Every structure is written in structure tokens, then in C-alpha cells.
UniProtKB/Swiss-Prot annotation:
Segment of the intact protein contained: 28 to 177 of 177
GO biological process: negative regulation of cytoplasmic translation
UniProt protein name: Ribonuclease alpha-sarcin
Organism of origin: Aspergillus giganteus
Cellular component GO terms, alphabetical: extracellular region
Superkingdom of origin organism: Eukaryota
General function of this protein: Alpha-sarcin is specific for purines in both single- and double-stranded RNA. Its toxic action on eukaryotic cells is the result of cleavage of a single phosphodiester bond in the 60S subunit of ribosomes. Inhibits both the EFl (elongation factor 1)-dependent binding of aminoacyl-tRNA and the GTP-dependent binding of EF2 (elongation factor 2) to ribosomes.
Similarity comment: Belongs to the ribonuclease U2 family.
Lineage of the species this protein comes from: Eukaryota, Fungi, Dikarya, Ascomycota, Pezizomycotina
Predominant subcellular localization, coarse grouping: secreted
Compositionally biased residues, Basic and acidic residues: 58-78
EC identifiers of the protein: 4.6.1.23
């Protein structure tokens, strides 16, 4: 339950997951948008294309190939999905399209269905460059 950080703001693992626990399990199906499928570098099903580098977490679940399709959460599509988890601990208005609050550079990335929390990703290179996992 350590505090995850992605060079900017903090992210209590409990909120990183809990903030998402509320988030409706689905590939982008919320009033706002988030959560959504996180290709992680993949195209949709097949592994990453010749020339790419996904985010390493340490789990063989998130590392595995996703099973996304034209639906989002069809059968057991173990597609990775991210979610903007703020530190404030406020349940982001991800379900309310309008109004919509600003997102975050850090999001909780977990495999489906079982939210196999892998960690939080964000661009800790400057402001918005490459994507990487936080450092807990």
C-alpha cells in the first residue's frame, strides 16, 4: 500500500487501486472516458510490432499479450486498462461526461478482469515524453 509516485504527485496504492475499484470495468465506457484499454504498446491482440518497448511491471499477466477487440470487454479479453487515479482521493468524475475535471499524468494500470494492479504509468522524462512505470 506504499505511496506510488510518478515524478510530480503522489499516488497511494490504496487510492491507485481504490480510486479505480469504483471505475467501471470496461475499455473506455464512462461518461468522461477513463478508464480505457492500454495497448501498452500492442496493436490490439498480437504482441507489440517489430520496434517497440512496453512498460515492464514484473507480472506475467500484464506482460502477457492482451485480448482486445471491437467491443472492449467481450469474453475474457485480458486487455490492460489504465485509470486516472488522483492523490486527493476524490473519486474523479470519470462517470460524469460534463462537467469533466482535468486528468492526471499518472494512472493505475491493471489487467482484466482481475485488476492485477501492475503499477502506475507516467512520463517522468520532463512533462510529456516517453511513458514508463512509476517507482514504488
Amino acid at each position: 500500500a506504499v505511496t506510488w509516485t510518478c515524478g510530480g504527485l503522489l499516488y497511494n496504492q490504496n487510492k491507485a487501486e481504490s480510486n479505480s475499484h469504483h471505475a467501471p470495468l470496461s475499455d473506455g465506457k464512462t461518461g468522461s472516458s477513463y478508464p480505457h484499454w492500454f495497448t501498452n504498446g500492442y496493436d490490439g491482440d498480437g504482441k507489440l510490432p517489430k520496434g517497440r518497448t512496453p512498460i515492464k511491471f514484473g507480472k506475467s499477466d500484464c506482460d502477457r499479450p492482451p485480448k482486445h477487440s471491437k467491443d472492449g470487454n467481450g469474453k475474457t479479453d485480458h486487455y490492460l486498462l489504465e485509470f486516472p487515479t488522483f492523490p486527493d482521493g476524490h473519486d474523479y468524475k470519470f462517470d460524469s461526461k460534463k462537467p469533466k475535471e482535468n486528468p492526471g499524468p499518472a494512472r493505475v494500470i491493471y489487467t482484466y478482469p482481475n485488476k492485477v494492479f501492475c503499477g502506475i504509468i507516467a512520463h517522468t522524462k520532463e512533462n510529456q515524453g516517453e511513458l514508463k512505470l512509476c517507482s514504488h
